[model samples]
Target: MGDVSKLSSNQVKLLETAFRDFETPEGSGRVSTDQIGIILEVLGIQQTKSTIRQLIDEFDPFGNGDIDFDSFKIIGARFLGEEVNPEQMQQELREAFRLYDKEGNGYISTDVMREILAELDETLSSEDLDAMIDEIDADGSGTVDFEEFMGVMTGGDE
Candidate 1:
C-alpha cells in the first residue's frame, strides 16, 4: 500500500522524524517490529502483537522482516483511510516479484512457483503446478512474468 496523501504535511513530518529516531542502528535504515511497537507505545496507540505482526506482513512485502521507510508510510496511510498510491503498489509488487524470481530473470519458473506456494501451505503436485502456470503464463513462456504475476496476485487481467 502506498497512500500517504491523507496525512497532513506536519503529521507526515512527525512520522518521518520518529521513524528516523527509532530506525535501526549503524545506518541499517530499518524499523524492527520491536521498534514499531515502541513507536506505537510512545504515541499512546494501543495494538496487540498479532495486529502489529499482520501490519508487518502486509506492509513488509519485501520480506525484509522489518519496516522500511516506504512500508512505514504505507502503514500510516492505511491508518488514515486513504487509498494506496498505484505507483507504490506496483513498486512493492515488483519487489515481491524480485524476491520470488531468485534467478533475477524477471520470470518465476514453475519450480520456484511450486516452492513459494508450498511455503504458503498450499502444496501442489507437479501437474497442478503445470496447470497453474498454464493459466497465468499468458505468453506461453512456461514462466510467470511480472505482468502475469501481478494479474495472478491481484486476480486481474494480464
Candidate 2:
C-alpha cells in the first residue's frame, strides 16, 4: 500500500467514509467483489467483469476474494495518482493488458480494444480506434502487444 500518511486529512476521511459505506453490517472489515461492483456502479466507473476480476486480483494479494480497508486505500491512492510501488504498478498493468488479450495470444486486436473501451463506457468509432491502433501498433502486426501497450500508456516508444 502507498503511504496513507502522505494523504491529507480530508482525503483520508473521504476514504474512510467510502470504506464504511461499502462495509457490510456484519463488520467483516472487508468488502466482497459484489460490493465493489456496486461501488463502481455508484461511482460511474464503467468496467467489465474481466477487468474487475483482474483489478481485484492485483489488489487482493491474500486471495481472499475480498478487499480490506488497506487494500481499498491502495486503490484509492492509485486512482488519485499517488505514488505507489513501481513493481506493483507494472504488475497491475500486465493484469489489465491480460483483460484485453482474452485469447492469450500475447496481442490485442482492434476488436478487443473496442470491447475494452466499451466496458469503460467510451464510444469510439471503429475508424478512430483503428487510427489509434495504427499509431501505436509499431510492429505493423495490426495488433498491440504488451510493449506497445506500455508505450502508448506511457506516451513514448518502448
Candidate 3:
C-alpha cells in the first residue's frame, strides 16, 4: 500500500516505465517480480538481481527491515537503471474499474467509492474520506468514471 512512499518519485517513474516493458498481463499489474527483476536488467542494467537486492537493503529508505524483492526492485532498478504500456496498465485499470462498476453504469457513485475505501482501510477518518473524495472524485460528478480512475492510476489528467 505504501507503493508511492516506498521509493523516490524519479525511481518510481523509471520503474513504472519498466512495468509496461514487461507486460502487466491479462488481469493484473505485474507479470511477476522474478520477471521484473530480470526486466530491470533488460533496460540497461548489468548487475545481478541478488547484488541489486543487497544495495536495496543497504540503502533502506524506510529503514524498517529487509524488504522483499517486489519492493526491493525499486532500489534494484536504482542501481540497475528502469515504460510501463501494460496497454497492460489500461487492461488492469479497466479490470479495476470493473471492480467498482459492477452495476455496469460506466461509473461508480461516490457513496460506493467511500464504502470501498472505508472497507479497504477501516481506520480512515471522515476527514480522510472527504479529502479522498476531493482528490479523486475529480469534477464533482458524484461518480468516478474510467477516465477519472485512469488519471489517478497514471498519476495525472489524461
| Top-TM-score candidate index | 1
Clashes of each: 0, 0, 6
lDDT of 2: 0.63
The 10-residue segment with the lowest total lDDT in model 1: 75-84
- How high is the CA lDDT of each candidate model? 0.66, 0.63, 0.57
User: Which candidate tops lDDT?
Assistant: 1
Report the lDDT tens digits of candidate 1 across residue range 1-158: 44766666665675687788888856678877667766655544437676677676676657675688777776665564433467764646566766888877777786676666556537666677667767766777777766666666666545
lDDT of 3 by residue, 1-158 (tens): 32435455666565666656664445355434445446557655536777556444454545433344465454544454232434854546566666777567767766566666687668878778667766876777767765555555465535
lDDT of 2 by residue, 1-158 (tens): 45555565555566667667877547677877656665555444536666677667777657775688777666555454423467775645566766678777667775676555455435756676666667667777767765566666665435
- Model 2 TM-score relative to the real fold: 0.40
TM-score of each candidate structure, all chains considered together:
0.43, 0.40, 0.35
Ranking by lDDT: 1, 2, 3
Give me candidate 3's TM-score against the actual structure.
0.35
**Error in Å for residue 99 of model 1:** 58
